[PDB]
Design a protein around this ligand. Structure first.
Ligand SMILES: [Zn+2]
Length: 140
């Protein structure tokens, strides 16, 4: 589990979104595994605006933050998980590291701020849904 809080937005894995999220929907994209809902309180997070490929991510199934190198966001085939069938996921970054389903929502951060959240795992990789292209998260 986990979310990003920026402005009056809450960014969550689409597959973990709640009824309240869907009832206060700003934007969602199944192909990206992302959903954004509206918040009353202002968020603590800053979104990275950059093309970093190194950062640190939180792994709940290890209670640890790990430094990682990761690929640039792309359209990647993802094997079946507990929460999706095998499918193509867009805007996905991969790193070598540990990720189980409940690790979804852990933040990946670089020197510029939040890069994305954990969205995929298995076979010794961790996949992250990028948010750095969502420039509208920083305004309105
Ligand atoms: Zn960066």
């Amino acid at each position: 589990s986990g979310a990003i809080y920026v402005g009056n937005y809450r960014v969550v894995n689409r597959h973990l979104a709640t009824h309240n999220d869907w009832a206060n929907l700003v934007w969602e994209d199944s192909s990206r595994d992302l959903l954004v809902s509206s918040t009353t309180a202002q968020g603590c997070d800053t979104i990275a605006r950059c093309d970093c490929q190194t950062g640190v991510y939180y792994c709940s199934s290890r209670r640890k933050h790990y430094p990682v190198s990761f690929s640039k966001p792309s359209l990647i085939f993802v094997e079946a998980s507990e929460y999706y069938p095998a499918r193509y996921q867009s805007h996905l970054m991969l790193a070598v590291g540990h990720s189980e389903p409940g690790d979804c929502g852990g933040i990946l951060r670089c020197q510029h701020g939040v890069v994305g959240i954990v969205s995929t795992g298995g076979n010794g990789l961790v996949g992250f849904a990028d948010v750095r292209d969502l420039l509208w998260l920083d305004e309105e």
